[PDB]
Amino acid sequence: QVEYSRVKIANRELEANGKVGATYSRDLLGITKASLATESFISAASFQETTRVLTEAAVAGKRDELRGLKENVIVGRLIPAGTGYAYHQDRMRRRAAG
């Protein structure tokens, strides 16, 4: 993901060893394909083929982390948008602060 690459590039460039930063090549995907490739498995398993997504999520042993809106709707918590966005902002600081 470009967002994951951007923070790694910024962190590597922040330190003295700026040459460690790796150049990338941006890619374009269709909606049916880009949606299924999201880093969270709870989403993209409630839209298209679930047999494929679960196994590729089962063997990898990944986590969902409930970052988007689809994941929070399924669980039943407050979505991180609008009135529920403020509540998810307060919770983030507490988790980071320990």
Binding site: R63, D64, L66, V75
Partner: protein, 50 residues
């Protein structure tokens, strides 16, 4: 030995659902027993089987 609450305390804090393969020992951990008969209920007493 009274005043015990299990329905309300069933709601526990959580985050970051995790998915992984299930081990046979882990599967046995979930299970609380065995199933060895293919019948569902005995009509002689309208009760669940053994």
């Amino acid at each position: 030995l009274l005043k015990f609450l299990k329905a309300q305390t069933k709601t526990e804090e959580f985050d970051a659902i995790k998915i992984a393969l299930a081990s046979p020992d882990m599967i046995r951990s979930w299970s609380f027993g065995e199933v060895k008969k293919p019948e569902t209920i005995n009509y002689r007493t309208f009760k669940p089987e053994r």
